[PDB]
Design an enzyme around this catalytic site. Structure first.
Site, PDB file in Angstrom:
ATOM      1  N   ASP A  49      55.949  36.813  23.220  1.00  0.00           N
ATOM      2  CA  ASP A  49      57.347  36.530  22.935  1.00  0.00           C
ATOM      3  C   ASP A  49      57.865  35.422  23.850  1.00  0.00           C
ATOM      4  O   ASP A  49      58.971  35.518  24.381  1.00  0.00           O
ATOM      5  CB  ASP A  49      58.188  37.810  23.027  1.00  0.00           C
ATOM      6  CG  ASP A  49      59.524  37.719  22.300  1.00  0.00           C
ATOM      7  OD1 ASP A  49      59.675  36.829  21.394  1.00  0.00           O
ATOM      8  OD2 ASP A  49      60.417  38.515  22.694  1.00  0.00           O
ATOM      9  N   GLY A  62      71.997  40.904  29.593  1.00  0.00           N
ATOM     10  CA  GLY A  62      71.055  40.646  28.525  1.00  0.00           C
ATOM     11  C   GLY A  62      70.966  41.799  27.543  1.00  0.00           C
ATOM     12  O   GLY A  62      71.216  42.944  27.915  1.00  0.00           O
ATOM     13  N   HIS A  63      70.586  41.477  26.300  1.00  0.00           N
ATOM     14  CA  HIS A  63      70.502  42.467  25.246  1.00  0.00           C
ATOM     15  C   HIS A  63      69.598  41.941  24.130  1.00  0.00           C
ATOM     16  O   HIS A  63      69.574  40.749  23.820  1.00  0.00           O
ATOM     17  CB  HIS A  63      71.907  42.865  24.769  1.00  0.00           C
ATOM     18  CG  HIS A  63      72.730  41.715  24.268  1.00  0.00           C
ATOM     19  ND1 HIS A  63      73.067  41.485  22.949  1.00  0.00           N
ATOM     20  CD2 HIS A  63      73.297  40.724  24.967  1.00  0.00           C
ATOM     21  CE1 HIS A  63      73.814  40.394  22.872  1.00  0.00           C
ATOM     22  NE2 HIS A  63      73.976  39.925  24.088  1.00  0.00           N
ATOM     23  N   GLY A  64      68.809  42.861  23.590  1.00  0.00           N
ATOM     24  CA  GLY A  64      68.026  42.666  22.394  1.00  0.00           C
ATOM     25  C   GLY A  64      67.933  44.013  21.681  1.00  0.00           C
ATOM     26  O   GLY A  64      68.527  44.996  22.113  1.00  0.00           O
ATOM     27  N   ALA A  65      67.182  44.049  20.593  1.00  0.00           N
ATOM     28  CA  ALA A  65      67.129  45.218  19.742  1.00  0.00           C
ATOM     29  C   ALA A  65      66.524  46.402  20.489  1.00  0.00           C
ATOM     30  O   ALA A  65      66.817  47.544  20.143  1.00  0.00           O
ATOM     31  CB  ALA A  65      66.335  44.878  18.507  1.00  0.00           C
ATOM     32  N   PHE A  66      65.674  46.133  21.498  1.00  0.00           N
ATOM     33  CA  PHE A  66      64.912  47.204  22.122  1.00  0.00           C
ATOM     34  C   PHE A  66      65.232  47.370  23.608  1.00  0.00           C
ATOM     35  O   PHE A  66      64.559  48.139  24.287  1.00  0.00           O
ATOM     36  CB  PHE A  66      63.424  46.960  21.896  1.00  0.00           C
ATOM     37  CG  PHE A  66      63.081  46.756  20.446  1.00  0.00           C
ATOM     38  CD1 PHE A  66      63.262  47.783  19.533  1.00  0.00           C
ATOM     39  CD2 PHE A  66      62.618  45.535  19.994  1.00  0.00           C
ATOM     40  CE1 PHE A  66      62.998  47.588  18.188  1.00  0.00           C
ATOM     41  CE2 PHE A  66      62.336  45.346  18.651  1.00  0.00           C
ATOM     42  CZ  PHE A  66      62.529  46.369  17.751  1.00  0.00           C
ATOM     43  N   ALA A  67      66.242  46.659  24.121  1.00  0.00           N
ATOM     44  CA  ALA A  67      66.606  46.848  25.508  1.00  0.00           C
ATOM     45  C   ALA A  67      67.953  46.216  25.819  1.00  0.00           C
ATOM     46  O   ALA A  67      68.408  45.296  25.151  1.00  0.00           O
ATOM     47  CB  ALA A  67      65.550  46.261  26.411  1.00  0.00           C
ATOM     48  N   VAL A  68      68.542  46.716  26.899  1.00  0.00           N
ATOM     49  CA  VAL A  68      69.747  46.175  27.486  1.00  0.00           C
ATOM     50  C   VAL A  68      69.463  45.990  28.973  1.00  0.00           C
ATOM     51  O   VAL A  68      68.726  46.777  29.577  1.00  0.00           O
ATOM     52  CB  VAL A  68      70.893  47.168  27.219  1.00  0.00           C
ATOM     53  CG1 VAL A  68      72.090  46.905  28.091  1.00  0.00           C
ATOM     54  CG2 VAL A  68      71.301  47.159  25.760  1.00  0.00           C
TER      55      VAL A  68
HETATM   56  C1  LIG Z   1      74.883  34.027  30.207  1.00  0.00           C
HETATM   57  N1  LIG Z   1      73.600  34.263  30.873  1.00  0.00           N
HETATM   58  C2  LIG Z   1      72.901  35.389  30.236  1.00  0.00           C
HETATM   59  C3  LIG Z   1      71.510  35.558  30.801  1.00  0.00           C
HETATM   60  C4  LIG Z   1      71.551  35.668  32.308  1.00  0.00           C
HETATM   61  C5  LIG Z   1      70.492  36.289  32.978  1.00  0.00           C
HETATM   62  C6  LIG Z   1      70.463  36.378  34.362  1.00  0.00           C
HETATM   63  N2  LIG Z   1      69.396  36.994  35.064  1.00  0.00           N
HETATM   64  C7  LIG Z   1      68.378  37.796  34.661  1.00  0.00           C
HETATM   65  N3  LIG Z   1      67.434  38.060  35.583  1.00  0.00           N
HETATM   66  C8  LIG Z   1      66.416  38.843  35.221  1.00  0.00           C
HETATM   67  C9  LIG Z   1      66.320  39.373  33.952  1.00  0.00           C
HETATM   68  C10 LIG Z   1      65.143  40.152  33.480  1.00  0.00           C
HETATM   69  C11 LIG Z   1      64.227  40.863  34.411  1.00  0.00           C
HETATM   70  C12 LIG Z   1      65.073  41.619  33.475  1.00  0.00           C
HETATM   71  C13 LIG Z   1      67.354  39.090  33.066  1.00  0.00           C
HETATM   72  N4  LIG Z   1      67.298  39.564  31.824  1.00  0.00           N
HETATM   73  C14 LIG Z   1      68.185  39.141  30.757  1.00  0.00           C
HETATM   74  C15 LIG Z   1      67.808  37.749  30.269  1.00  0.00           C
HETATM   75  C16 LIG Z   1      66.381  37.679  29.759  1.00  0.00           C
HETATM   76  N5  LIG Z   1      66.169  38.575  28.628  1.00  0.00           N
HETATM   77  C17 LIG Z   1      65.689  39.818  28.693  1.00  0.00           C
HETATM   78  O1  LIG Z   1      65.213  40.313  29.723  1.00  0.00           O
HETATM   79  C18 LIG Z   1      65.708  40.583  27.389  1.00  0.00           C
HETATM   80  C19 LIG Z   1      67.092  40.910  26.791  1.00  0.00           C
HETATM   81  C20 LIG Z   1      66.551  42.306  26.457  1.00  0.00           C
HETATM   82  C21 LIG Z   1      65.431  42.098  27.479  1.00  0.00           C
HETATM   83  N6  LIG Z   1      68.359  38.269  33.410  1.00  0.00           N
HETATM   84  C22 LIG Z   1      71.545  35.847  35.078  1.00  0.00           C
HETATM   85  C23 LIG Z   1      72.604  35.238  34.424  1.00  0.00           C
HETATM   86  C24 LIG Z   1      72.621  35.145  33.036  1.00  0.00           C
HETATM   87  C25 LIG Z   1      73.792  34.478  32.352  1.00  0.00           C
HETATM   88 MG   LIG Z   2      56.340  40.303  25.614  1.00  0.00          MG
END
Ligand SMILES: CN1CCc2cc(Nc3ncc(C4CC4)c(NCCCNC(=O)C4CCC4)n3)ccc2C1
Ligand SMILES: [Mg+2]
Ligand SMILES: [Mg+2]
Length: 269
Positions: free
Chosen positions: A131, A16-22
């Site tokens: 959000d 995962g990725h956004g402007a303020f975290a990876v």
């Molecule tokens: C193609 N796909 C992309 C997304 C994804 C996420 C996951 N499992 C996942 N589990 C937990 C988390 C969270 C606790 C930190 C996570 N985080 C990325 C997805 C949610 N977005 C964010 O947290 C923001 C991106 C900048 C913060 N992603 C598993 C497979 C996939 C496959």
């Molecule tokens: Mg929030």
């Protein structure tokens, strides 16, 4: 391979990725089978990133719920910050929707019962998320839609809001923002309920209830339309229609409140 307390990850396992975290997939250093997600600074926005991750630690450490991604550990220092969180093996709701196109009412109900459970804790703690969107609803498979567990993630824009006060920070994703938010007005906890309404509509129909070419166009749309009604498909059940009309009210004073939402007939088993 970087390490953080009892945990490790490699920057090759970006999830995962956004402007303020990876975010990277990782594991416990002893129990290799315990998967985690490790959230780190995005260096492109170092200072803001550091601030948001620090704030997210403060919020998440107060929230323990099956439908909120768990904070296992974290590490904050002068020049670095890490959050070690629950790994959701199902990915996000956005991807699930891309694959399914639309969800049945039964699946929507299952997902929304869970989201509602999380919001009950947020609301009781006086926390607003700000959000909510499909990218931040994550899926966990312990198999079919009856076994899927839904978890709210990404509390980087979240804040405490005292029950007699209003927020005014412009943040979130415009397609999911309540009108009062995108029109730069004061808002409260009911802004999240609009976002939830938008997520539910998107699950049902595969689209946004109010589409526009740009954030500015969407804003002007909300400005010009004081009476605003979403287009709901004819086939929609009566309770789901009622829920969507009550959530997607432009004026926050009129919008469904938390108690109505939590006890809404559409959520009955
Ligand atoms: C193609 N796909 C992309 C997304 C994804 C996420 C996951 N499992 C996942 N589990 C937990 C988390 C969270 C606790 C930190 C996570 N985080 C990325 C997805 C949610 N977005 C964010 O947290 C923001 C991106 C900048 C913060 N992603 C598993 C497979 C996939 C496959
Ligand atoms: Mg929030
Ligand atoms: Mg509001």
């Amino acid at each position: 391979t970087e390490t953080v307390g009892k945990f490790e990850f490699s920057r090759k396992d970006l999830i995962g990725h956004g402007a303020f975290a990876v975010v990277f997939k990782g594991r416990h250093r002893e129990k290799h089978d315990l998967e985690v997600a490790v959230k780190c600074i995005n260096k492109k926005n170092l200072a803001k990133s550091q601030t948001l991750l620090g704030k997210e630690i403060k919020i998440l450490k107060e929230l323990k719920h099956e439908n909120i991604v768990a904070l296992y550990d974290f590490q904050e220092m002068a020049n670095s910050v890490y959050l070690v969180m629950e790994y959701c093996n199902g990915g996000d709701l956005a991807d699930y929707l891309h694959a399914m196109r639309t969800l049945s009412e039964d699946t929507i109900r299952l997902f929304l019962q869970q989201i509602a459970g999380a919001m009950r804790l947020l609301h009781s703690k006086g926390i607003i998320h700000r959000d909510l969107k499909p990218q931040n609803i994550l899926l966990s498979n312990p198999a079919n839609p009856n076994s899927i567990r839904v978890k709210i993630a990404d509390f980087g824009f979240a804040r405490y809001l005292q029950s007699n006060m209003m927020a005014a920070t412009l943040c979130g994703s415009p397609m999911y923002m309540a009108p009062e938010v995108i029109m730069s007005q004061h808002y409260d906890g009911k802004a999240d309920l609009w976002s939830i309404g938008t997520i539910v509509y998107q699950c049902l129909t595969g689209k946004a209830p109010f589409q526009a070419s740009s954030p500015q166009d969407l804003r002007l749309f909300y400005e010009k339309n004081k009476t605003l009604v979403p287009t709901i498909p004819a086939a929609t059940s009566a309770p789901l229609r009622q829920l969507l009309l009550a959530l997607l009210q432009r004026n926050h004073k009129d919008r469904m409140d938390f108690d109505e939402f939590f006890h809404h007939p559409f959520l009955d088993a």
